[PDB]
């Protein structure tokens, strides 16, 4: 390309699969922030949410094996997770998470 | 004086009358293309020549053939403007009449069984615009001429720099326009060898044998014979007198010297000489002698005679023996020794050896060898010594026949051998490889013809293949040929050739110089790593043909040249220059164009030669040149004179004032630098010029020139309508001309192309007058820069080196502010997930950024946009994306989730702020047109109809004015005509046949007018409404044009016309710059230190002359402000124009009062002066101009420091200099990057501003860091900044965390290295 | 004759 | 094999070579099942070998295989080797992040350790540092908050940028990097604009002139790199040339011209014979217009000598000097003799001043002295008002008579040649000799007329004085120009060489003041082109030599 | 290979490795 | 004498 023997089309091809370092820093910061918010919880609902969403864990889990933790009951797990969710939605402990929108 | 020139007459300081006006500057392009395209009834040029060179197409069997009849060019689908808008090539269809003639097999060969005439489409031929440019793919391009070697024979030598001894070795090389090369060399053993297409050397007797030359015939051709007889039992020398002039000489009456002048004894003349037997021992036989009784060959040709051989022929009865001539000085045995080393003894062996060297490793057969040698040089299909090549060949060998031949023969080869042997002997000289009669110019017509012929041959192969089948009953001529290879060839040449270049469009001078550029590179030319010093030098034959100043400074020096001012190309492609004849000692008006070969013979005088009132020379001995050497020659021996003082230099060098006071280096720089100037908001004439500006401005095509004279009926910033005179009107014409002006159109270099009217409504205009001024034009004069007040002094280090100190008033007055127009394109394509949509519904973007877009999602016209603003909104469908669990949680908490589409919209680039001046929408045929595209279509149609109706109105006014003139030849009252309503004129009833016939005629004419107007508008609507031919997969394209005003600032590059360039260092406040006694400050301060060492003195002279010119302008301004009488204004103007003993006679007495007012008004800002190159204003004239304006004769004033008020200790040179703003702007060169894109394979940062790339830390930088000892900085550059993928992310995180520490790893490039070395089957690995 | 001489010297060329 | 914009695909030639190898291998395997003539199998094996050698190294075996676009396919050896190879293009040199580039202007107000950096360039280069500081001092909650604040270009972003660049050195580079002084570390000063401001005294190290030159800026990240920049690569440390040991920061051009003008000596200047208490009163007399810069006065000088052993001896005396010499002494550091200033100061004298200051005082005093020297030189070169005019090029009247004599003698020797007394070669040689002698004599006459003037002294007679011609002052000070250039301007251009090397007999009898005619300009171009092309080729030759040495 | 050059500031580092390979 | 497989094959 151009009147140059030192120019080729293959020197202008990007690597679109890469992740920007800004996004990596955002991922790490979000990890720290959600760790703090979950540590601002009672342990049982925090662990229930970790199991239900897969935080710090290899696999995600549904209501069944989350119940299999202590008591195998579905609706109690759902109600616990919903209580934890509206508790986190409280404007007092969510400003650090709202900044990630 | 024309009206345009009368408005502002430039004072001419030249003293030598100009006898030949400069020719049209773009002739080299238009003439060549006219040769290519125009019909040639004799068939030596262009499409006709190519068609006759390929056709008729003969089938191998002989069943039928295809013959060419005629060709024509159709009408273009589009004109130049809409070809530029849509992005299609401006071209014409090629239609050729071909006849398929089918012969009769039963009848004798040559019987016309059947004929079939038909017209066939043979491709699309691009056309030249009136300005010498092509429009390819919507872009203006120029195809530059090529300087190559003329076909024919060249005789050269190694100059004794190859062998250990000197032994100058001579060679001959024949090169055709098309075909194989042939070489004939001499070795250090004095034997002549042949090369065919630069392969293994051969004895060079093979070719003569191939043509059928016996050894005796070769010896006869290449040597003279000396005879011997046996007369009265004595040896008998047939004496040639010239030969004699070591033994006892016969002719006892006139005994010569014995074993120890010649002319005195040879005067009497005898034919009997006796020589000893030993004189035969050294000779070599010249014939083959046979004995019938023995039946054997006693002695062979080219064999040394011995005593036993002498006895053998003595018994054989032969008495006459002829042998070859051989000397050491004048004649040589070279061909005989050549024959000795030759192993071939017959023609068949000759063809066998030629085949083996041609095609090694192939079984040689007689028929194949014969076909190979016939096709090498004696076949019209594979060899063509063209007309120019044929004439050069004939002139080289001195052959006066076979002018129309195209192939070699026995005569040609043998004369080549004879000339090469002669040059070895000493008679004759080698050829000069740089001499301009040996190098040829090849222009756009020739290479277009060549590529067309290539495509034609490509068609002809398949046509011959098809015709050979036989089944031809239902075939038409249009079913046999293949137009796509021809189109491919022409579009290859016009789109991908090295010589087909993007048009240089900074200013008119750049255009003109690009069109007049000759390149030695390209196909069939030189390569830059294989071109030595000799080709780059200025040959003595460049005088008047190639400019010795204008050439690129860099690797391309000497390889790209500029045509001289009066240079021309003859009918054979060789440059020629005009000269004035000298007859009877007087230098006449008659001119003659001489080439390089012709120029050497005569003695040519210079334009500086003093002349008398009678037309002859004054001095007894005049300075002239002959055979390339300058000297003093008698007046009576001079045969020619130069026509102009700028005959040697190019146009750009011709635009440099006081060029003779500048060193060639800085003149080179100034000529190169004038073409980089960017046009400004307001165009200002150069106060000090050369008188060439009008020619460049008019011939560049940027201005609007009047095709016919008349009175300007209507003027507006986009239109000029002129009413043509009665005397120059074509019968039955409208009588009015319309000029539509280009307004704020982007150029190829993202500059502004604007045409501003320079006329008044009612102003009389003649043919050739300038009506509108294009970019860098002022009243028909080229205006590349601005006139700036200049002081030569140092100022506190701010003009250190080449730095320039600029006042704030320069920025306030917007003197160097430029308009840059930029194109931004958003393309909505079709993807796998779906169709990209242009819409205003952009996710994650508020109404703050949607203010400037309309409903369709496109910004409005006139929207002031800044960096990051959305121009056209586009959304692209996206697939499923894996959400990280700690973002699924965030989705759970706050339920917002809108990621169906991704925002890929067109945005303004960073640090770019401007106004949207135009938006165009192109939609594929079959895609819905959104509201904005419909609005553009409606406005386009409305403007088209408005313009068409406006034309109809104005041309009907002109036509009815002509009809009224016809009626007024008798004269009546038109009030009665106006009493009846205009339309009601068609409702009148006439009973008389004389009146009724006229009524019917008028009705029919009105109907025809309506019909033609309807047809024109229907065609225009068809052109507007048709869908675009968008690329496959493309649904829509939107183009936005951004106009940016760029003001001068530090870092920008400024320059004059004398090679004095610099970078602005500071924008000084007005109160800090030096000022004179009247309180007027300077505008720019330049460093004097840069003048003496660079020897560019024309700038000081320009400064002084500009000071004088501005002083005279100030005097005129004063004399106008005080409302002084016209008599004194006229007196002052006449005094100004009478200064110096110049060739200009301007008589103000012949100018009207209004003309004098206009001229004085146009001289308010200074008096323009012309100082032609090598005919410029002397020091005395400059000083006299200074005294006229009441300015110091030294050009130096007393200046005061604005910071202190204290006068400087010495006078300072203050004047006016023409400065230019070069297209090297700090806005386009400032770049910075922290982290961005990376390469796909090497994983390294990209390169360039467009890619937001990074700077390259090359090998020398690494050496510098190693020399310092900075190991850690070097490791940072190698690993964590370029290609350590994990390390660079870790570094970014650490910097964000404020840690400033790195964990270096292995670069990815080394891993790639290892992988490739392993792919080469080599085990490379790392040990622990 | 200055740069070619140095280049020829550092490569330890044989004189002709 | 990647999708380009517009739907097109881009591939590497290795794909084509591998495809050929696989196709021929599969064909050979097929031909050994459908049992075939030995000739066919032999040909297929030949194909396989040719394809493998083409893949490994194209062009070595014979005709190089080309693609559909008619140029040879690039093999693995081509990936590995060459100027474009991986070793030299991507391993020994790389494109780097945190780098920028811009045009360079001149900063005369800068110190030797400072460089002017544009604000936008600093914002782009130091972006992670700005994000870090905004997060640390609390105005940015997350990293997108910091990114938005930087993009919006708020004021606090500018204060943060000042604090990050406060003492972070940057590396400036100019190509070609012929030696290690082509990259140096500077402390950045944020400036409004888009051009880098460069200290004049370092230009000689960079070979940098302000005619469009561009420089690259690099940001060292880690602490080790910063300390290497501050200690090793910083401009104040590199003031001696490693090739010879001489100072490389010697002043040039306007600095030299100003120091020369201020130290010159004029006869019967205003305030001659005055007695001054010291440099301060010389300054006071100059500022009050009592005395000129070039007045011969007597001044009380207190001078301190530092000996080799370190002895410091201070003593005061009255010295016959010039006002400018004392005013310049005001900035000379203690420890140096006054004889170094009591003379007209050319380039050599200023270089000697700096070298002596480094030899007897050290480094810090040397850099302060260099900065003050450059400031003073600029100031007084601005105050001098030195300018070039057409009247400064005085053509000696002896030139015309000398040309006439040479032409007459050339006519005489032409007559002698026509008589056969002398041959053609002798005639050529002695004509060359006579024109060379004429050129030398014209140059000598022009120098003698240009270098002197006659003035009226206090007692009233006429005295000989060195000239104050602008061109003469330019040449003699060593700022710009040498005797050859003044000879070309106001004397004779001399003999010029034909492109082959021969020297034309008739010279150019014109200088650049009256101007050359067409043929003289043509002969000038003959040599100008040769010079330019020789420079172009010699640059590459020298680069290859330097590479080989490295 | 992206390592510290055995010259200047990196010199000491390499010397340390030359000790470690010695032991 | 030749290296091209074409000619050897012929
Ligand atoms: Mg430069």
Q: Are A13 and D10 in contact (CB under 8 A)?
A: yes
Distance D206 CA to ligand 1 centre (A): 11
Query: What whole-number distance in Å separates Cα of residue D536 and Cα of residue B668?
Result: 15
CA of B8 from ligand 1 middle (Å) equals 39
Nearest Cα residue in chain A from B1237: A14
Nearest to B1230 among D77, D98, D121 (CB): D121
Q: Could you tell me how many residues make up chain E?
A: 23
Helix%, strand%, coil% for chain E, nearest 5: 65, 0, 35
CB contact under 8 A, B1271 and E10: yes
Chain D nearest-CA distance from E11, in A, is 14
* B560 closest CA partner among B494, B495, B514: B514
Q: Do F9 and D43 touch (CB under 8 A)?
A: yes
Name the region of D268 (left: φ>0; alpha: ψ -120 to 50; beta: rest): left
CB contact under 8 A, A13 and D10: yes
Alpha carbon B414 to its chain centroid, in Å, reads: 40
Of B1269, B1270, B1306, the CB nearest to E2: B1306
Examine residue B325 and say whether the peptide bond preceding it is cis (omega within 30 degrees of 0): no
Q: What is the CA radius of gyration of chain D?
A: 35
β-bridge mates for residue B830, sequence order:
B835
Q: Is B1079 exposed, middle or buried (0-12, 13-18, 19+ CB in 10 A)?
A: exposed
The answer to whether the beta carbons of residues A43 and A29 sit under 8 Å apart is no
Q: Is E4 in Cβ contact with B1310 (below 8 Å)? A: no
Contact D173, D181 (CB under 8 A): no
The CA-based angle D324-D328-D334, given to 5 degrees, is: 145
Residue B99, strand partner residues: B67, B117
E12, closest residue in chain B (CA to CA): B1271
* Other C-beta atoms lying within 10 Å of the C-beta of residue B138: 14
CB contacts, 8 Å: C6 with chain D: 545
Closest residue on chain A to B896 (Cα) = A101
Residues B962, D485: Cα–Cα separation, whole Å: 71
Angle (CA) D187-D193-D196 rounded to 5° is 40
Q: Do B1288 and A27 touch (CB under 8 A)?
A: no
Inspect the structure and tell me whether chains A and E have 3 or more CB pairs less than 8 Å apart.
no
Counting CB pairs under 8 A, whether chains D and B reach 3 or more, is yes
Question: Which chain D residues contact residue F5 at CB under 8 A?
Answer: 43, 46-47, 50
Tell me whether chains B and F touch (3+ CB pairs under 8 A): yes
**Do B1194 and D389 make contact, defined as CB atoms within 8 angstroms?**
yes
Cα Rg of chain E, angstroms: 9
The Cα–Cα gap between B351 and B357 comes to: 10
Nearest to D143 among A9, A13, A29 (CB): A29
**b vs e for B645-665, b when ≥16 Cβ sit within 10 Å of the residue's Cβ?**
bbbbbbbbbbbbbbbbbbbbb
Gap sites in chain B (C to N > 2.5 Å), preceding residue numbers: 245, 260
Yes or no: say if B444 and B29 are a contact pair by the CB < 8 Å rule: yes
Closest to B1244 in 3D by CA, of B1284, B1276, B1271, B1274: B1284
Tokens 């000085």 — which residue? B329
Interface test with B, best of D54, D94, D169, D469 (most B CBs within 10 A): D94
Give the closest residue to B511 by CA, choosing from B26, B111, B68. Answer: B26
Was D371 annotated as part of a binding site?
no
Q: Do C3 and D545 touch (CB under 8 A)?
A: yes
Indicate yes or no: CB of D144 within 8 angstroms of CB of A26: yes
Is the CB of residue B429 less than 8 Å from the CB of residue B417? no
**Taking a C-beta distance cutoff of 8 angstroms, is the pair B155, B165 a contact?**
no
Cβ neighbours of B361 in F, within 8 Å: 1-2, 4, 7-8
Here the tokens at position D369 are 């002295």
State which residues have CB under 5 angstroms from ligand 1, the bound ion.
D 209, 211, 213
The alpha carbon of residue B1284 is apart from the nearest alpha carbon of chain E, in Å, by 9
Q: Which resolution, in Å, applies to this structure?
A: 2.7
Q: E2 at the D interface (CB within 8 A)?
A: no
- D211 assigned ligand-binding residue: yes
**B440: closest CA among B273, B576, B278, B578?**
B576
DSSP state at residue B67? E
Cα→Cα distances B533→B383, B528, B537, B551, D500, Å: 32, 11, 7, 14, 10
| Maximum separation of any 2 CA atoms in chain D, in Å | 124
**Which chains are within 8 Å of E by 3+ CB pairs?**
B, D
From D538, which residue of chain C is nearest by alpha-carbon distance? C3
Cβ contact F5–D63 (<8 Å): no
Q: Does E23 touch chain D (CB under 8 A)?
A: no
Nearest to D399 by CA among D464, D488, D527, D520: D488
Q: How many CB pairs under 8 A join A and D?
A: 24
List CB contacts (< 8 A) between B360 and chain F: 1-2
Rounded distance between C-alpha atoms, residue B1167 and residue B1161, angstroms: 11
Torsion of CA D63, D64, D70, D71, to 10 degrees: -140
Confirm or reject contact between B317 and chain F (CB < 8 A): no
- Would you call B269 helix, strand, or coil by DSSP? coil
Cα torsion angle, D486, D490, D491, D492, sign: positive
Residues 6+ positions from D132 with CB-CB distance below 8 Å:
B1295, B1296, B1297, B1298
Q: Which residues contact B244 (CB under 8 A, 6 or more apart)?
A: B256, B262, B266
Q: Output the CA B775–ligand 1 centroid distance in Å.
A: 29
Q: How far apart are CA B607 and CA B646, in angstroms?
A: 9
Q: Please list every residue in chain F whose beta carbon sits closer than 8 Å to the beta carbon of residue B359.
A: 7
Tell me the C-alpha distance between B1267 and D5, whole Å. Answer: 45
Please list, in sequence order, all residues whose beta carbon lies within 8 angstroms of the beta carbon of residue A56, skipping any fewer than 6 positions away.
A50
The residues with which B184 forms a beta bridge, in sequence order, are: B172, B194
Q: Which of A13, A25, A99 sits opposite D141 (nearest CB)?
A: A99
Give dist(CA B388, CA B574) in Å, integer.
10
Burial degree of B456 (CB within 10 A; 0-12, 13-18, 19+): buried
- Give the residue from B781, B647, B656 showing the smallest Cα distance to B20: B647
Q: How was this structure determined?
A: cryo-EM
A46 touches chain B (CB under 8 A): no
**Interface subset of F 1-10, CB within 8 angstroms of B:** 1-2, 4, 7-8, 10
- Burial-class residue B143 by CB neighbours within 10 Å (0-12, 13-18, 19+): buried
Please enumerate in sequence order all residues whose Cβ is within 8 A of that of B810, keeping only pairs 6 or more positions apart, or say none. Answer: B788, B816, B1048, B1067, B1083, B1084
Q: What is the dihedral of CA B453, B457, B460, B462, to 10 degrees?
A: -140
Contact between D9 and D3 (Cβ < 8 Å)? yes
d(CA B670, CA B665): 9
Length of chain A: 101
| Pair D344, D287: CB distance under 8 Å | no
D387–B791 C-beta distance less than 8 A: yes
D476 assigned ligand-binding residue: no
Question: What count of CB pairs under 8 Å joins A to B?
Answer: 68
Q: What is the DSSP string of B201-243?
A: -B-S-HHHHHTT--HHHHHHHH--EEEEEEETTEEEE---HHH
Distance from CA of A25 to the nearest CA of B (A): 6
D189: buried, middle or exposed (CB in 10 Å: 19+, 13-18, 0-12)? middle
Distance CA(B813)–CA(B803), nearest Å, equals: 21
Which residues of B, range 1199-1258, sit inside 8 Å of A by Cβ? 1235, 1237-1241, 1243, 1246-1247, 1251
């Amino acid at each position: 390309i151009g009147d140059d023997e030192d120019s080729h089309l293959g020197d202008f091809i990007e690597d679109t699969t890469l992740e920007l370092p800004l996004d990596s820093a955002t991922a790490t910061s979000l990890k720290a922030a959600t760790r703090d918010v979950l540590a601002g919880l009672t342990p049982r609902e925090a662990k229930v949410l970790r199991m239900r969403f897969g935080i710090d864990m290899n696999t995600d889990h549904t209501l069944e094996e989350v119940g299999k933790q202590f008591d195998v009951t579905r609706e109690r797990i759902r109600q616990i997770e919903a209580k934890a969710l509206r508790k986190l939605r409280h404007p007092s402990r969510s400003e650090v998470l709202r900044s990630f929108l | 004086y024309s009206y345009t020139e009368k408005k502002r007459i430039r004072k001419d300081f030249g003293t030598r009358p100009q006898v030949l006006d400069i020719p049209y500057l773009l002739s080299i392009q238009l003439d060549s293309f006219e040769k290519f395209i125009e019909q040639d009834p004799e068939g030596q040029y262009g499409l006709e020549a190519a068609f006759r060179s390929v056709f008729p197409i003969q089938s191998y069997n002989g069943n039928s053939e295809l013959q060419y009849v005629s060709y024509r060019l159709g009408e273009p689908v589009f004109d130049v403007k809409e070809c530029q808008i849509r992005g299609v090539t401006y071209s014409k269809p090629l239609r050729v009449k071909l006849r398929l003639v089918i012969f009769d097999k039963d009848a004798p060969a040559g019987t016309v069984k059947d004929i079939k005439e038909q017209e066939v489409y043979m491709g699309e031929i691009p056309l030249m615009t009136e300005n010498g440019t092509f429009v390819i793919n919507g872009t203006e391009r120029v195809i530059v001429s090529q300087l190559h070697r003329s076909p024919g024979v060249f005789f050269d030598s190694d100059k004794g720099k190859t062998h250990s001894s000197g032994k100058v070795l001579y060679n001959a090389r024949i090169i055709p326009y098309r075909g194989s090369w042939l070489d004939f060399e001499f070795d250090p053993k004095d034997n002549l060898y042949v090369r065919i297409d630069r392969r293994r050397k051969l004895p060079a007797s093979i070719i003569l044998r191939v043509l059928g030359k016996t050894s005796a015939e070769i010896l006869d051709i290449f040597f003279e014979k000396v005879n011997f007889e046996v007369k009265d039992q004595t040896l008998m020398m047939e004496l040639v007198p010239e030969r004699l002039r070591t033994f006892d000489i016969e002719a006892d009456g006139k005994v010569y010297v014995e074993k120890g002048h010649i002319r005195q004894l040879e005067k009497d003349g005898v034919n009997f000489i006796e020589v000893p037997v030993e004189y035969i021992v050294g000779k070599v036989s010249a014939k083959d002698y046979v004995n019938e009784a023995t039946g054997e060959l006693i002695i062979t040709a080219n064999q040394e005679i011995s005593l036993e051989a002498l006895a053998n022929l003595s018994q054989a009865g032969y008495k006459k023996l002829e042998v070859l001539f051989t000397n050491d000085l004048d004649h040589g045995p070279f061909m005989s020794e050549t024959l000795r080393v030759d192993s071939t003894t017959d023609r068949i062996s000759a063809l066998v050896e030629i085949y083996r060297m041609m095609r090694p490793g192939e079984p040689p057969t007689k028929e194949a060898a014969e076909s190979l040698f016939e096709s090498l040089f004696f076949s019209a299909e594979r060899y063509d010594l063209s007309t120019v090549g044929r004439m050069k060949f004939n002139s080289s060998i001195g052959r006066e026949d076979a002018e129309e031949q195209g192939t070699l023969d026995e005569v040609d080869i043998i004369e080549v051998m004879k000339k090469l042997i002669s040059i070895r002997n000493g008679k004759g000289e080698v050829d000069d490889i740089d001499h301009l009669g040996n190098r040829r110019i090849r222009s756009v017509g020739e290479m277009a013809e060549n590529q067309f012929r290539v495509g034609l041959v490509r068609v002809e192969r398949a046509v011959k293949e098809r015709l050979s089948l036989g089944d031809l009953d239902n075939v038409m001529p249009q079913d046999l040929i293949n137009a796509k290879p021809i189109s491919a060839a022409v579009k290859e040449f016009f789109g991908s050739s090295q010589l087909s270049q993007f048009m240089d469009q900074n200013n008119p001078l750049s255009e003109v110089t690009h069109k007049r550029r000759i390149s030695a590179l390209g196909p069939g030319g030189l390569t830059r790593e294989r071109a030595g010093f000799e080709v780059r030098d200025v040959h003595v034959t460049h005088y008047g043909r190639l400019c010795p100043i204008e050439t690129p400074e860099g690797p391309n020096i000497g390889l790209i040249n500029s045509l001289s001012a009066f240079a021309r190309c003859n009918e054979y492609g060789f440059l020629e220059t005009p000269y004035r004849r000298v007859v009877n000692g007087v230098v006449t008006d008659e001119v003659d164009y001489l080439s390089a070969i012709e120029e050497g013979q005569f003695v040519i005088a210079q334009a500086n030669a003093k002349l008398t009132e009678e037309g002859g020379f004054a001095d007894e001995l005049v300075t002239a040149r002959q055979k390339g050497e300058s000297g003093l020659h008698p007046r009576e021996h001079v045969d020619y004179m130069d026509v102009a003082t700028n005959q040697v230099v190019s146009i750009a060098a011709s635009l440099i004032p006081f060029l003779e006071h500048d060193d060639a280096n800085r003149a080179l720089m100034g000529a190169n630098m004038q073409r980089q100037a960017v046009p400004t908001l307001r165009s200002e004439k150069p106060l000090v010029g050369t008188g060439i500006e009008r020619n460049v401005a008019v011939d560049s095509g940027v201005t609007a020139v009047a095709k016919r004279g008349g009175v300007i009926q209507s003027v507006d910033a986009s239109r000029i309508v002129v009413k043509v005179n009665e005397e120059e009107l074509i019968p039955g014409e409208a009588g009015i001309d319309i000029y539509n002006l280009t307004k704020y159109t982007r150029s190829n270099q993202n500059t502004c192309i604007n045409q501003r009217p320079c006329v008044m409504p009612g102003e009389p205009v003649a043919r050739g007058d300038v009506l509108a001024d294009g970019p860098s034009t002022d009243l028909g004069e080229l205006a590349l820069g601005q006139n700036m007040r200049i002081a030569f002094m140092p100022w506190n280090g701010y003009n250190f080196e080449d730095s320039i100190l600029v006042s704030e008033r320069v920025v306030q007055d917007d003197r160097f502010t430029t308009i840059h127009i930029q194109e931004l394109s958003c393309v909505a394509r079709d993807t796998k997930l779906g169709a990209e949509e242009i819409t205003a519904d952009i996710p994650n973007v508020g109404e703050a950024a949607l203010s400037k877009l309309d409903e369709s999602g496109i910004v409005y016209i006139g929207a002031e946009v800044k960096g990051g603003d959305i121009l056209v909104g586009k959304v692209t469908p996206k697939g499923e994306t894996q959400l990280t669990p700690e973002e699924k949680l965030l989705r759970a908490i706050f339920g917002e989730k809108a990621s169906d589409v991704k925002d890929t919209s067109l945005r303004v680039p960073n640090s770019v702020a401007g106004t949207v001046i135009d938006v165009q929408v192109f939609t594929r045929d079959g895609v819905e047109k959104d509201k904005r595209a419909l609005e553009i279509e409606q406005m386009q149609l409305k403007e088209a109809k408005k313009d068409l109706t406006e034309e109809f109105q104005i041309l009907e006014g002109g036509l009815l004015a002509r009809v009224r003139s016809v009626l007024l030849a008798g004269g009546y009252t038109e009030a009665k005509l106006s009493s009846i309503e205009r339309k009601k004129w068609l409702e009148q009833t006439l009973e008389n046949e004389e009146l009724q016939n006229q009524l019917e005629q008028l009705a029919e004419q009105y109907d025809e007018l309506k019909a033609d107007f309807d047809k024109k508008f229907e065609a225009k609507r068809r052109k507007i409404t048709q869908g675009d031919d968008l690329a496959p997969g493309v649904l829509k394209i939107v183009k936005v044009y951004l106009a940016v005003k760029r003001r001068i600032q530090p870092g920008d590059k400024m320059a004059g016309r004398h090679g004095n360039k610099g970078v602005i260092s500071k924008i000084n406040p007005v109160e800090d710059m030096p000022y004179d006694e009247n309180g007027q400050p300077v505008d720019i301060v330049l460093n004097p230190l840069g003048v003496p060492s660079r020897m560019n003195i024309g700038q000081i002279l320009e400064v002084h002359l500009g000071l004088a010119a501005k002083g005279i302008g100030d005097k005129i301004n004063q004399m106008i402000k005080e409302q002084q009488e016209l008599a004194k204004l006229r007196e002052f103007l006449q005094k100004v124009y009478d200064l110096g003993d110049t060739r200009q006679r301007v008589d103000i007495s012949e100018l009207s009062d209004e003309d004098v007012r206009t001229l004085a008004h146009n001289l308010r800002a200074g008096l323009p002066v012309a100082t032609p190159v090598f005919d410029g204003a002397p020091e005395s004239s400059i000083k006299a101009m200074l005294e006229l304006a009441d300015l110091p004769a030294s050009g130096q004033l007393t200046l005061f420091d604005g910071r202190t008020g204290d006068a400087f200790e010495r006078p300072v040179t203050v004047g006016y200099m023409y400065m230019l703003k070069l297209n090297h702007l700090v806005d386009d060169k400032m770049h910075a990057r922290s982290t961005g894109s990376y390469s796909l394979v090497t994983q390294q940062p990209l390169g360039g501003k467009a890619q937001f790339g990074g700077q390259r830390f090359g090998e020398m930088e690494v050496w510098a860091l190693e020399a310092y000892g900075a190991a850690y900085t070097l490791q940072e550059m190698l690993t964590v900044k370029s290609d350590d993928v994990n390390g660079r992310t870790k570094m970014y995180k650490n910097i964000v965390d404020g840690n400033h520490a790195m964990e270096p790893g292995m670069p990815e490039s080394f891993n790639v290295l290892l992988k490739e070395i392993r792919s080469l089957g080599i085990n490379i690995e790392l040990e622990d | 004759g200055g740069l070619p001489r140095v280049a020829d010297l550092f490569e330890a060329r044989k004189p002709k | 094999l990647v999708p380009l914009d517009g739907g097109r695909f881009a591939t590497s030639d290795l794909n084509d070579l591998y495809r050929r190898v696989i196709n021929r291998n599969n064909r050979l395997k097929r031909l050994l099942e459908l049992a075939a003539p030995d000739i066919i199998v032999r040909n297929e094996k030949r194909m396989l070998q040719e394809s493998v050698d083409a893949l490994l190294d194209n062009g070595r075996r014979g005709r190089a295989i080309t693609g559909s676009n008619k140029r040879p396919l690039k093999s693995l050896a081509d990936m590995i080797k060459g100027k474009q190879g991986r070793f030299r293009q991507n391993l020994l040199g790389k494109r780097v992040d945190y780098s920028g580039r811009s045009v360079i202007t001149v900063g005369p107000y800068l110190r030797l350790h400072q460089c002017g950096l544009p604000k936008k360039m600093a914002l782009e280069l130091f972006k992670p540092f700005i994000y870090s500081k905004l997060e640390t001092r609390g105005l940015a909650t997350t990293i997108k908050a910091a990114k938005k604040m930087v993009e919006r270009e708020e004021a606090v972003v500018w204060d943060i940028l000042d604090e990050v660049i406060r003492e972070h050195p940057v590396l400036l580079n100019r190509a070609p990097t012929l030696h290690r002084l082509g990259i140096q570390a500077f402390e950045p000063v944020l400036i409004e604009g888009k051009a880098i401001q460069l200290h004049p005294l370092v230009c000689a190290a960079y070979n940098a002139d302000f005619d469009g030159d561009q420089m690259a800026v690099h940001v060292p990240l880690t602490l080790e790199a910063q300390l290497e920049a501050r200690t090793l690569m910083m401009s104040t440390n590199n003031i001696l040339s490693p090739a010879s040991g001489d100072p490389i920061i010697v002043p040039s051009q306007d600095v030299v011209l100003g120091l020369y003008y201020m130290t010159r000596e004029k006869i019967n200047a205003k305030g001659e014979g005055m007695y001054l208490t010291g440099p301060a009163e010389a300054e006071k007399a100059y500022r009050t217009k009592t005395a000129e810069l070039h007045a011969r006065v007597k001044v009380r000088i207190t001078e301190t000598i530092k000996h080799e052993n370190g002895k410091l001896t201070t003593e005061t005396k009255m010295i016959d000097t010039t006002v400018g010499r004392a005013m310049l002494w005001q900035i000379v550091p203690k420890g140096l003799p006054y004889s170094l200033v009591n003379q007209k100061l050319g380039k050599k004298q200023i270089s000697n001043l700096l070298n002596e200051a480094y030899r007897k005082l050290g480094l810090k005093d040397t850099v302060i002295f260099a900065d003050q020297i450059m400031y003073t030189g600029f100031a007084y070169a601005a105050l001098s008002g030195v300018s070039v005019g057409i009247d400064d090029m005085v053509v000696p009247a002896a030139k015309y008579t000398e040309i006439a004599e040479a032409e007459e003698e050339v006519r005489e020797i032409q007559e002698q040649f026509q008589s056969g007394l002398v041959t053609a070669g002798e005639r050529y040689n002695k004509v060359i000799d006579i024109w060379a002698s004429t050129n030398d004599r014209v140059a000598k006459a022009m120098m003698e007329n240009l270098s002197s003037e006659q003035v009226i002294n206090r007692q009233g007679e006429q005295e000989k004085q060195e000239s104050f011609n602008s061109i003469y002052m330019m040449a003699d000070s060593g700022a710009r120009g040498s005797a050859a250039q003044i000879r070309q301007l106001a004397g004779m251009r001399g003999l010029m060489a034909r492109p082959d090397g021969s020297i034309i007999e008739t010279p150019i009898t014109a200088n650049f003041k009256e101007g050359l005619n067409v043929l003289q300009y043509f002969i000038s171009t003959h040599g100008a082109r040769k010079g330019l092309a020789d420079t172009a080729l010699k640059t590459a030759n020298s680069g290859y030599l330097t590479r080989r040495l490295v | 290979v992206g390592r510290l050059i055995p010259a200047g500031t990196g010199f000491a580092y390499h010397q340390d490795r030359q000790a470690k390979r010695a032991q | 004498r030749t290296t091209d497989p074409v000619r050897m094959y012929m």
